[PDB]
UniProtKB/Swiss-Prot annotation, chains A, B, C:
The species this protein was found in: Homo sapiens
Identification of the protein by name: TNF receptor-associated factor 3
Gene name for this UniProt entry: TRAF3
Subunit-structure text: Homotrimer. Heterotrimer with TRAF2 and TRAF5. Interacts with LTBR/TNFRSF3, TNFRSF4, TNFRSF5/CD40, TNFRSF8/CD30, TNFRSF13C TNFRSF17/BCMA, TLR4 and EDAR. Interacts with MAP3K5, MAP3K14, TRAIP/TRIP, TDP2/TTRAP, TANK/ITRAF and TRAF3IP1. Interaction with TNFRSF5/CD40 is modulated by TANK/ITRAF, which competes for the same binding site. Interacts with TICAM1. Interacts with TRAFD1. Interacts with OTUB1, OTUB2 and OTUD5. Interacts with RNF216, OPTN and TBK1. Identified in a complex with TRAF2, MAP3K14 and BIRC3. Interacts with BIRC2 and BIRC3.
PTM characteristics: Undergoes 'Lys-48'-linked polyubiquitination, leading to its proteasomal degradation in response to signaling by TNFSF13B, TLR4 or through CD40. 'Lys-48'-linked polyubiquitinated form is deubiquitinated by OTUD7B, preventing TRAF3 proteolysis and over-activation of non-canonical NF-kappa-B. Undergoes 'Lys-63'-linked ubiquitination during early stages of virus infection, and 'Lys-48'-linked ubiquitination during later stages. Undergoes both 'Lys-48'-linked and 'Lys-63'-linked ubiquitination in response to TLR3 and TLR4 signaling. 'Lys-63'-linked ubiquitination can be mediated by TRIM35.
Result after altering residue 96 to A: Abolishes interaction with LTBR, CD40 and TANK
Highest classification ranks of the organism: Eukaryota, Metazoa, Chordata, Craniata, Vertebrata
Location within or outside the cell: Cytoplasm; Endosome; Mitochondrion
UniProt disease link: Immunodeficiency 132A: An autosomal dominant immunologic disorder characterized by increased susceptibility to infection with certain pathogens, including Herpes simplex virus and Mycobacterium abscessus. Immunologic work-up shows impaired production of cytokines, including INFB and IL6.
Domain notes: The MATH/TRAF domain binds to receptor cytoplasmic domains. The Ring-type zinc finger domain is required for its function in down-regulation of NFKB2 proteolytic processing.
Effect of residue 99 to A: Confers resistance to cleavage by enterovirus D68 protease 2A
Function summary: Cytoplasmic E3 ubiquitin ligase that regulates various signaling pathways, such as the NF-kappa-B, mitogen-activated protein kinase (MAPK) and interferon regulatory factor (IRF) pathways, and thus controls a lot of biological processes in both immune and non-immune cell types. In TLR and RLR signaling pathways, acts as an E3 ubiquitin ligase promoting the synthesis of 'Lys-63'-linked polyubiquitin chains on several substrates such as ASC that lead to the activation of the type I interferon response or the inflammasome.
Region listing for (Microbial infection) Interaction with glycoprotein N of Andes and New York hantaviruses, in residue ranges: 29-52
Length: 205, 205, 205
């Protein structure tokens, strides 16, 4: 099949087109597989987003999530974004299941992060709404763990968001693990952190 | 082509790879076809969800939907979920276009279902918000059909949601079909059911 | 290969099946590529939708967007829909970066469009909520450009939406370009238009 190999039998090239087309759809299905994946989160963050300044966050797998904090597989966790109004300050909270800073290894870390809103430019600065971060008690009628605080105008943690998330400024030694793990708070391998940024004293239309 | 069949001509195996790859993308496109499908609903339930305790539901195809009730192709219809607040009690309503129970075949059935919220554990029980379920009148200025009621603490229809939807506890003989079909209420093969779970008398932050 | 061509060698038909299957997935991936695309917008319009009657719209690329107005590549821009309530009047605004009508080529055009709501039939007509359309000032502490107005019951621009968007009835000569371009308002190739449809004087449950 000398002067007839590529002649009679050049199907070996036709097979080259099938494969290429196959390689094309392989990438698309994949890109599409990833695209689809970001939709859930996008729905997920939206289904759980609040626009009244208040926020209730949920953390499942505290154990499988706590064990990763200790083994440094994921030092912190962020909450779904939330707002003070439909077009107001954008925010969220940051946590460390196995503490950090002065409360590291012996506490729960909970910070308040002033994210970069899409509507920044029409709002007042520096941010100045009082805050209240708490640990929710899921007991018969016990009490939750809270601690409010007012931003430091001086702090560059409360200014018009240049980069993505502002600088996390909460509490290093919020609550001792030996207290949260030894109590209701943890129920069914999960807990809930609350956040109450005042918006009332800022007439909401 | 004895000792040369699978030798010279084993393309019949190469064709086995193209097909398999083809069978792989066939499943993905399909799974992806179904995934995409659930997004609409997910958007649809969200685009129509209310967080102020009130709810306006819409039912199109009353006829093609009523005829299936009679021919037992779909005895009831559920509404989009709704809430009393951003992180409050989750709910929704249930209907029977061709009645059920004592109003079966001669009435419209409308129930109030206390679904299992994602935020159950931080809320008060048993549920105790008064309710008002009504049939909206689309007439020049006529009146709608309503009937409020207060949960029975005794009832296991108003407790912290173990399974998915709580136990449907509304009204079997809400309105007679011969009254809804013989009146404005039905306009352009559709109707709207309203629901007013009190939330006011529960200071909403 | 006379009476054996299609006989021994009819792989040329087998290759016809691979391709067809390939052509099938080609269309699906594409349809799916477009479907995925509409989700973003659907999320995008939702992430930015307001249900309190107020609205803050954002227009990026004013220049690349203004230059198209002059070269007639896109005479106007529409905002994300918005409402007065969860099930209230649906609306939005219309703009012309290079004016239109009496303010054409020398002004910014901003109209108020009463869209066709999904919940039209249960609401009061003709629409009668005062309106306030303004141009937001992104300056150190300057002022924005506003101008309220009350619908004309006479106008067929404020009635129960037959077709899609009602008839755009705003202001042709809202603000002179030479004033908006020569001032803060434009910052980082973008601007923001505001809209304040009264809803307060319509007890919102």
């Amino acid at each position: 099949l000398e002067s007839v190999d590529k002649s009679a039998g050049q199907v070996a090239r036709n097979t080259g087109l099938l494969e290429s087309q196959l390689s094309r759809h392989d990438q698309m299905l994949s890109v599409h597989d990833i695209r689809l994946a970001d939709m859930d989160l996008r729905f997920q963050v939206l289904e759980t987003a609040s626009y009244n300044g208040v926020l209730i966050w949920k953390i499942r797998d505290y154990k499988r999530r706590k064990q990763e904090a200790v083994m440094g597989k994921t030092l912190s966790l962020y909450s779904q974004p939330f707002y003070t109004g439909y077009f107001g300050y954008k925010m969220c909270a940051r946590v460390y299941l196995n503490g950090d800073g002065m409360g590291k290894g012996t506490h729960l870390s909970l910070f308040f992060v002033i994210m970069r809103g899409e509507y920044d430019a029409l709002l007042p600065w520096p941010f100045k709404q009082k805050v209240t971060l708490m640990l929710m008690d899921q007991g018969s009628s016990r009490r939750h763990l809270g601690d409010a605080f007012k931003p430091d105008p001086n702090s560059s943690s409360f200014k018009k968001p240049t980069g993505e998330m502002n600088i996390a400024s909460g509490c290093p030694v919020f609550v001792a693990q030996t207290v949260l793990e030894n109590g209701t708070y943890i129920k069914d391998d999960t807990i809930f952190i609350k956040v109450i940024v005042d918006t009332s004293d800022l007439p909401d239309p």
